[PDB]
Swiss-Prot record, chains A, F, I, J:
GO terms for cellular component: bacterial-type flagellum basal body; plasma membrane. It is found in: Cell inner membrane; Bacterial flagellum basal body. The keyword Transmembrane applies. It is a multi-pass membrane protein. GO terms for biological process: bacterial-type flagellum assembly; protein secretion. The chain crosses the membrane at residues 18-38, 55-75. This is Flagellar biosynthetic protein FliQ. Required for the assembly of the rivet at the earliest stage of flagellar biosynthesis.
UniProtKB/Swiss-Prot annotation, chain C:
GO terms for cellular component: bacterial-type flagellum basal body; plasma membrane. The keyword Cell wall biogenesis/degradation does not apply. Role in flagellar biosynthesis. GO terms for biological process: bacterial-type flagellum assembly; protein targeting. The keyword Transcription regulation does not apply. It comes from Salmonella typhimurium (strain LT2 / SGSC1412 / ATCC 700720). It comes from the Bacteria. Belongs to the FliR/MopE/SpaR family. This is Flagellar biosynthetic protein FliR. It is found in: Cell inner membrane; Bacterial flagellum basal body. The chain crosses the membrane at residues 41-61, 62-82, 127-147, 171-191, 209-229.
Length: 89, 203, 258, 203, 203, 89, 203, 203, 89, 89
């Protein structure tokens, strides 16, 4: 039960979270960036606008990425329930 | 001696179940549902059912050894609380030490101002209980933290997705319940729970 | 004394258990505000009125296989209670979904402390309806029904049937209906308000509803609870009546289908 | 007896329900009300009633066997208390076994370290219970997620519509609730829920 | 033979307190403490205390007429109680018959399918009791529920006041309890109560 | 015990509640309305802001209104304990 | 006879402690622990200890007057209860009568339509007890409301601070426990209570 | 003496436990599970276990001073009355004394207006008990405030961060719990708790 | 037990609450006001922003004010436990 | 149990909290500041935007800072359980 091990926990987990959430919000970014640029150059600025495209993109994302993302969790979750009798010591 | 009798009847069984197992079990499950929202599973019934059963399986060898040790000469009802106590505690003790952190024993042996400590029964009755229980608590909360992490992960995720989309006013902790649900179900890990609490309990 | 007349009393246990089941199964009718030793009195009260003249003689055989017999009686008792409370539950769900648009629902998040906001509104409706019985009979119509059940379903041997249950396990159903029927005009209004708060935003994006909307809709939510009170009193007796038709049917149905 | 007797009086009515059904049924309900907000029913009251009514409705034929197969032949003559236990037990066994997973079997039979097995019914009484329970939990949560979906759809839809008009400020959590109740009732599906539980039990 | 005896302990005195009053009293106070949040009063100690005291106050004249008519001539033990029992019931009879509704009378005379009754005393002890109980209950709740509504409306005012500010987090039930107290004592209301149960009992 | 009388109960009580709670939350309204307007016209929009003034107003309210509000309850409460022997019948 | 014997043995222990004191004390603590959140102190055990002790110190002198006055001649058992009940009730009487409001007296007596009242012992017990108990309740809740004020000061201050800037989601109930936990000990006040109930008991 | 005896059967045990220790034990945990959210550990089950066990470990020297000095000559059962209670209370006296604040003595004895006070055995039971208690409670709430601070720190941090992000939506209290779990177990301090109550106990 | 006295209770207590909570939230106000103004004049408007400074200020406040605030409570609390035997009458 | 000591409690603890939470939210600030500036000068103003970068930064923070932060708590927590028998007196 070293604080070192306890650190290794977070080191892994937070990287897992990186793996999951990374693509989605990136596509969100790129979307709002591009449309928001088009909000200039014949300005035409309202408010929400680019929101609606952002629902398309994320929706596509789970389609394209999908299963292997799951696999990630499926792996590590198991590994947890793997080492549990070694976590005591 | 009806005073002493019914007096013992009042609290006694709770003590008896403290003596063994099943504490870490319950504490664990009760720490499940705090992730995954509401009571959900019916604490009145199910949890105590599982939690009892597992104990039966686990202590079972020691148990039948007891039925031979106590109940079998208890055919005569031979001697009430004489070597039923000794023979009773021997597996109790050895198993208990087997589960007992050995630093604790240094602590309570120190504060107890003990004499020669040689036999496990040279570590007296009263000395075992507090340490052993504290141990069980320790491992219990250890596992307890081992559980939660993936769920927190999922929640940070969803939250981040919503914030990214401009979802600011949604009740995310309500929406996240089904996904926690599946990502527990999909993985079959519900076994690995009771494989873990089975193996890591004895070790 | 001895055991002699004791066992004579020990005949009656079966209709007892039937009755005690009747009461405890009808709690919000006769409930936990009452001390348990009164709620255990009414049984021994009522049987000696009913119990005599009943032709039942049974014996507790070895390890009482007749314990199986007990599996019978309680059901009938249960049968009533968890029907009746529809008339209550349909009212409770009548109240709640109202205030949920108001101050109530902001407990939406996970596990706070206890159920909290429950008594806000729905506990008033909890009560009124529980008064409107005693205009007529709280337990009496029931008790009579039971009396009839002593004629229909005697005792012992081949116990029961099924498929009447799923009928009454169909039941509500109308729970949510009769919930709706009451609160329909309220809700249908309050949606309009909730949106009109919306329309301002395109004009006034900044209105941050907790600054404006709630101190408004709270009162209106109270007004409507003042003016829509009267429609209740004619309505409830639909609710009760229907269920009486039911229990008439069901209680009359299953025995002949044995 | 006295002591262990009263003990059995305490535990028994839990066990019998556990022994049969109804542990998978309730969780479906709790999952219901956890959609559509508050209790919206007297949990300790009605939703115990309904969920009992179903249970009796399902297990009925098994029972009728049990009686026709036991008391009426036990009354009179032949078997006493022995093939009573056999011939009344076996329908329970077979029944329960039908829905049990294959794995959890291997899991608990493994941990208890049972030798070569032949009779599936000869797989003892105690062993089946926990695997049974766990399995049925998995089933339960599955069914629950199948429940939620349209509602999540609802909230997403309404929230979205709001987001379209500049409604970011407003907490759609309120508005969706009357719709939930409408489009639950207008489609009558409560029937579809009690049936969907009824047939999908075994099929 | 612990069974029959110690089981029979509870029955008889409970009945003897059922005969007359101590019923509607307990009920009303229980209803009180159901408002004002918690038990907030010592069930095991006081409210049982009150509910005994007020009775001993109200039933005083009857007890007198008995003491005159029964206890003191019972000092002879002249007749093994007959007119002790009977002639002691007749005051209980008339008193009882005061507040029994007619509905319960004819109704239960029907559930007995009895013949035409002349003397109300000829209505035997057995028929009087239950109708009595049911009726007086039907008074008890008629008062008790009419107690709450002011308290609960206070609750509405509170909760409204909070939520109007952005107070969303609080268990407002606690901020209630002081005001529910002041308006209990400030209005003197207690004396009003025991004056209500004082008179409107008998009238 | 007519359902009519039982209705009269609510008819009175709910109006009592009207009497009590009415002024307070009105002042709350007016507050958040005015400040919230000032949240425009040199916009300067944060979040809470007008909350703090709303604590002032309510605090003043109990001061200004105070005793006669009490009187209301003091009246009707008594009246209840008045008619209780007539409520039975 | 024994029916009578055990009959009184059922209610008595409550009755005695009810007779005098200890009724205000309990209710005071019950009104305390609801301040400061959860059950906190374990009423199941502690309170009975506390409030029993404080009384035994307080009611002590009168109890002594019983000892010399009743227990001591009860050594002979010269007369049983004859002037034991009377004589010992006298300090009970004047004891209570100092502590009883005089408005309640005229109230309840007026209901009973008593004749000329001069002697306090000419006021019989059945006029005594209930009026007194009502007086106690009045006091107990008086002090009861006098308790809360500072605590509610705290809670409203905190709540105001939390909602002052964002933070609308925080559960103030936990942050507001510690301060309420200091102002209990910091001002020493736990002595100030028992000093207060102590002195203001008698007056 | 069926009456007095069985009444002391009702009260006695809670008294005997209050006479000693174990209160200051209980309140502490009772304030622990207030941190860490839900009831967590099974109050009806474990906390009683810990809290009792610690005691039986602690009082042990005095306990068997009562067994040796008291029950061993009580083999005679010499006198059921005098120095069992008195003598056996002599260690109860001292043990009770040395843990007590001094001021409460002057307070309470000051009330009773006793004469010359020198011997602690000249300070009777009824002077001891309340002071003993009020003292203990002082200490208990002291420690109680010593606890919470780090946990509070955690939650303040998380809340601040989230609200900084524009998380206003989020339920902060649901996130923190695991951190609160490790930062408890990481430091092993669970030992140090019973190290604290244990060492700090006597003085 | 006059309703008048009962009013005096509140009259004092609510003013005590005024004394305690007043400075803190004032500083909060001034903060969000000033920054929020700076949210104009080279606009640069996000959302939270001025929140973080608001944690500084309050934190400083308890430091600067501190003990005498306590004294307030310490006074009045005692006074309560002072007059309790006179509160009965 | 001087009010002085009780003050020392807070004096230490609140500074501990300073130590922990300080870096994170600072980086948050700097982030939203810089991006928010870039929300001018070719304006292109949507709403959330800079939120996403703010999740990066904090995520990095626990990585970079990490263990020694823990050490802080690990120290003081122990010290508490150290002096507990002296806290009584």
């Amino acid at each position: 039960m070293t604080p070192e091990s306890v650190m290794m926990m977070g080191t892994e987990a937070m990287k897992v979270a990186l793996a999951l959430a990374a693509p989605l919000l990136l596509v969100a970014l790129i979307t709002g960036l591009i449309i928001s640029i088009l909000q200039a150059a014949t300005q035409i600025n309202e408010m929400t606008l680019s929101f609606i495209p952002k629902i398309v993109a994320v929706f596509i994302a789970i389609i394209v990425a999908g299963p292997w993302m799951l696999n990630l969790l499926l792996d590590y979750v198991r590994t947890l329930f793997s080492n549990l009798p070694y976590i005591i010591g | 001696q009806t005073l002493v009798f019914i007096t013992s009847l009042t609290f006694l069984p709770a003590i008896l179940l403290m003596m063994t197992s099943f504490t870490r079990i319950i504490i664990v499950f009760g720490l499940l549902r705090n992730a995954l929202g509401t009571p959900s599973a019916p604490p009145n019934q199910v949890l105590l059912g599982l939690a009892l059963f597992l104990t039966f399986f686990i202590m079972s060898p020691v148990i039948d050894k007891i039925y031979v040790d106590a109940y079998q000469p208890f055919s005569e009802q031979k001697i009430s609380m004489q070597e039923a106590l000794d023979k009773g505690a021997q597996p109790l003790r050895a198993f208990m030490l087997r589960q007992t952190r050995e630093a604790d024993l240094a602590l309570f042996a120190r504060l107890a101002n003990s004499g020669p400590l040689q036999g496990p029964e040279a570590v007296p009755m009263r000395i075992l209980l507090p340490a052993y229980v504290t141990s069980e608590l320790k491992t219990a909360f250890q596992i307890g933290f081992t559980i939660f992490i993936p769920f927190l992960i999922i929640d940070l995720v969803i939250a981040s997705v919503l914030m990214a989309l401009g979802m600011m006013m949604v009740p995310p902790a309500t929406i996240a319940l089904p996904f926690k649900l599946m990502l527990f179900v999909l993985v079959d890990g519900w076994q690995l729970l009771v494989g873990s609490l089975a193996q890591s309990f004895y070790s | 004394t001895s055991e002699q007349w004791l066992y004579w009393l020990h005949l009656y246990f079966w209709p007892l258990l039937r009755v005690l089941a009747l009461i405890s199964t009808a709690p919000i009718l006769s409930e936990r505000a009452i001390p348990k030793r009164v709620k255990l009195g009414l049984g021994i009260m009522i049987t000696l009125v009913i119990a005599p003249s009943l032709p039942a003689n049974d014996t507790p055989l070895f390890s009482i296989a007749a314990l199986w017999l007990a599996m019978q009686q309680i059901l009938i008792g249960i049968a009533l209670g968890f029907t009746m409370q529809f008339a209550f539950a349909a009212v409770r769900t009548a109240g709640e979904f109202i205030g949920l648009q108001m101050g109530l629902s902001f407990a939406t998040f996970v596990d706070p402390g206890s159920h909290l906001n429950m008594p806000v509104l729905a506990r008033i409706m909890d009560m009124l309806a529980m008064l409107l019985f005693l205009t007529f009979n709280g337990h009496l119509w029931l008790i009579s029904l039971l009396v009839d059940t002593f004629h229909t379903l005697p005792i012992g041997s081949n116990p029961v049937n099924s498929n009447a249950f799923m009928a009454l396990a169909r039941a509500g159903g109308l729970i949510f209906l009769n919930g709706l029927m009451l609160a329909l005009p309220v809700i249908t209004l309050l949606l309009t308000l909730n949106l009109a708060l919306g329309l301002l935003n395109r004009m006034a994006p900044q209105l941050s509803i907790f600054v404006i909307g709630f101190p408004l809709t709270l009162t209106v939510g109270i007004m409507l609870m003042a003016a829509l009170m009267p429609l209740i009193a004619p309505f409830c007796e639909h609710l009760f009546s229907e269920i009486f038709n039911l229990l008439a049917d069901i209680v009359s149905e299953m025995p002949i289908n044995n």
